[PDB]
Design a protein around this ligand. Sequence first.
Ligand SMILES: Cc1ncc(C[n+]2csc(CCOP(=O)(O)OP(=O)(O)O)c2C)c(N)n1
Ligand SMILES: Cc1ncc(C[n+]2csc(CCOP(=O)(O)OP(=O)(O)O)c2C)c(N)n1
Ligand SMILES: [Mg+2]
Ligand SMILES: [Mg+2]
Lengths: 537, 539
Amino acid sequence: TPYCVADYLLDRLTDCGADHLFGVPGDYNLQFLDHVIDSPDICWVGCANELNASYAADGYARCKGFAALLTTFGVGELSAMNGIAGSYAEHVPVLHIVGAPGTASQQRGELLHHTLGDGEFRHFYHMSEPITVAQAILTEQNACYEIDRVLTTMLRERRPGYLMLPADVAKKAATPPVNALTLRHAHADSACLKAFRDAAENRLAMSKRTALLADFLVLRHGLKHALQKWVKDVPMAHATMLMGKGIFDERHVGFYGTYSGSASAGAVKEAIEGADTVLCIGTRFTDTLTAGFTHQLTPSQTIEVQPHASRVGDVWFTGIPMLQAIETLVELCKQHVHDTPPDGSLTQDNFWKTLQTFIRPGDIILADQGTSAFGAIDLRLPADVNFIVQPLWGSIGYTLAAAFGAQTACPNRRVIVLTGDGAAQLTIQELGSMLRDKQHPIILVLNNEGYTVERAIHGPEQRYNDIALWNWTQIPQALSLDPQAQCWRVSEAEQLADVLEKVAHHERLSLIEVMLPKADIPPLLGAITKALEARNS
Amino acid sequence: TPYCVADYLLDRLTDCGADHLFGVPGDYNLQFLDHVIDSPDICWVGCANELNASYAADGYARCKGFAALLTTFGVGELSAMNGIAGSYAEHVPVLHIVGAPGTASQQRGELLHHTLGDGEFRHFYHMSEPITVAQAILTEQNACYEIDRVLTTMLRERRPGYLMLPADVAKKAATPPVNALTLRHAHADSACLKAFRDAAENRLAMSKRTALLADFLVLRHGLKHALQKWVKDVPMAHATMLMGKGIFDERHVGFYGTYSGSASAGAVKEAIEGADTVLCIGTRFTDTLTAGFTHQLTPSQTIEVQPHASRVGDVWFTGIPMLQAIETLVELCKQHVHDTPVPPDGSLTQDNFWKTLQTFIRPGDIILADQGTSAFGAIDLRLPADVNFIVQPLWGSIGYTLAAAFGAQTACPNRRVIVLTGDGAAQLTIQELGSMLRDKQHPIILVLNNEGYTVERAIHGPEQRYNDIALWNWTQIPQALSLDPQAQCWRVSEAEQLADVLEKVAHHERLSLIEVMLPKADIPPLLGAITKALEARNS
Ligand SMILES: Cc1ncc(C[n+]2csc(CCOP(=O)(O)OP(=O)(O)O)c2C)c(N)n1
Ligand SMILES: Cc1ncc(C[n+]2csc(CCOP(=O)(O)OP(=O)(O)O)c2C)c(N)n1
Ligand SMILES: [Mg+2]
Ligand SMILES: [Mg+2]
């Protein structure tokens, strides 16, 4: 087993923080897979299909900062395309490795399985170009520096990359590197830095009250601790939006709730929108995050920091790393910013209140699109919570499979899965992977007997919002010969509270089927369901 | 409810042969969905996910000649891409309708859900371009003629098309067409047809024994009955390959078995490879179909017919419709081809499994088999008359079969559907079993359970953990995916038990799921030839 390109790729992957590889085998990637199996540094995680694997890698990367997916040419990689696209949309660095037919076969234009039957082998590489920041077709002549380039760009942009690995290229000789792959820390030109620093300083110097609004780009670029220490050293009103929830301990002084535009609690609206200066850090004002773009924040009111550029009022300063922009603003703030800030029947209301008493520091909480995410936005999170939600891409089914990737990343943390009954149908077979791997998530299936969110938007009585009605508490014993799962169906707040006490220490996988009313929607959902379909009558 | 673009599209769908629409709802397609529900001609079929929906539409199109898929912008269409890709690879005309944000929203570049967050709304349209023969972004100014163009091109090529339907465009006023959309039959220039006819005749006039090899393009372009009539009116040696199985009644004189290159039965090799002229009709000699390109057929030995061009020896004749090429060859064969073709154990094995199933299949059956030890065992089934045999060996996506079966049963509620899937394959699309049960379908699902990924076990790393899977409780799945399953499940390990169960479910009064327990390292005959010349490649 002489060291080869397959080994070099695995060495560089682990350098980037991935200790696991998700995917599904196929004949074009089997020989590469042998190197994954034999490696002591990377653990193969076989998934039940490729879409789920790409969701799982995404959740993993939201826990470890990096992840990798392996599929086979054509059928595998195209099955995962929606996963990689969602990682691109939400800035999740997932590496898609595609095992491919050998280069000689490709050059001869053979009529191989997993092709369109036209002798062409680059169609799927090109279709992946819009949803990655870097891609390469690996050859014997470029392998090691193309691997390094794509991984490096992935680290810089915190977004997916793609590598086509022909089976023969994987076996070509390589050399172990002495140094791990690192992304050299960027620094703005000092005159550029001064221009931004001066404009921010002069703006902040005239602020009576300043507020801090941070979101998901802070998470992706590893700046959570910097944002927490900032508000600790400089107390002020602060918030996140739905995507970046979990950046802050929401019990801390100065936090009043998650900002969601006009749907915000009044205290949040006043704390953020009422400040005469609002620092917008790693923020993206999407339609869901702002209740249909009804946020009230003007350019002259705001300072914003993006990964490579920052803005003060009307002026953009480009080529400033977000790390340096934040550091600049922390020092400047230090220089001013002074004066500190049980029922019966289950409803959406008492469910989220019951869940509120249950969550604890260390929890990993995932919520899918639908009433799950828009109820969970109102959870007041304690310290050290990883809150994983996908409101920009918005692919239902993401959450159950992402939970499998997240638990793989963090076996000793408690994983709470909040999924609608409709969402869980799209990726149910990854429940079988959790049981196979002896994971102990707490899966809460919000069963309101259909697509309730779509009922809110349009056609509440229309049969297209109906689904097959599953027997949720029997699924683990169908997807395992020895599930060792604890299942309950609950319809009362007291039953849910009692069950939550029983599963608090997650010694087994648990599935809680939560019986909820069909037309019941959380507060934010009612607010977001007033201008959603406003475009078309 | 004035007639609008949404209604015009649905009317054109019916014209093309589709009576159902598969997919998953989303806020960007909901108002269009209201027109699907209200339509008396199109029945909405909600699916458990978009990948499965696209597989189901594919199976439906292989029964009805056309199918349609509805997804939502971004998250929906990208989940279905592998299905549309397989429909393109295997020439299945599935129409992908993508409900999209309204045009003004797109023009403003808003940060909308199901986008990449860049204000760009044409990324996914562009990514679908390689896997469709036609696509359009529908506007108020082009809607009805772009709809007709894309559907017409799909009918001519028998391949997928794509339409992005912004929500506002769908409500724009339209007019019901008086005439159905039709694919006018193309005609070769008569001098061009003559050139092919003369060359084919000169070859056939000197051929001592001529054989006929027809495959899947015959099925896609509606020429099954023509090929059956050809071999009835002109007896001669004939075969298909795996993809085209079902073109012929395989009990009829002159049929000796399915051709698969060096893995063929000796009678087939002699009948096909031993002929001095082999008419190759709608054929694609893929690696799977030829046991690793070990077929022995030379250019001067062959005449081939593709959808728009035909070849005699080394010379190609282009701009000839496959239909007219076939009509020409039928005439020439009637002139020059004057032949009379020479005409239960205990424990379950691969061999006695297929022998048991052989006695069970009947005319009218729809038989679907997935990649693995299913399709390559099913290749040896001797099909009676009027069987629809659905296999996907060129694209080769496992999981396709269970979801395609749901589409096939939807198309043909009164036909018996037999699903041959491995335990590994069924895991990728299992949630569509729930759709089968919801809709009270009665397929016969045989899960070939040998406790892992046997097909790759054979090719590489048989003891490697990546060929293992989670072990499911197959006979409990219907009761998990339904509150009241109209199902019966059995687990069988003996040939006689399988025979007894199959006899019980012959009239398919309920969904039946049969977990068939097979040995871990047991592979069918044809795979043994395909497993040696597969790791003969990239190693
Ligand atoms: C992959 C994908 N397909 C379709 C949609 C459209 N969609 C948005 S919400 C929804 C229904 C979600 O239902 P469920 O999980 O039961 O949620 P709830 O009833 O709590 O709203 C659908 C189909 C989507 N977001 N993602
Ligand atoms: C979508 C997809 N992913 C991966 C592959 C590669 N592949 C080919 S066969 C196979 C395993 C098939 O397992 P099973 O259905 O149990 O078959 P059997 O054990 O009878 O061979 C896999 C993963 C594929 N063809 N399609
Ligand atoms: Mg629901
Ligand atoms: Mg198997």
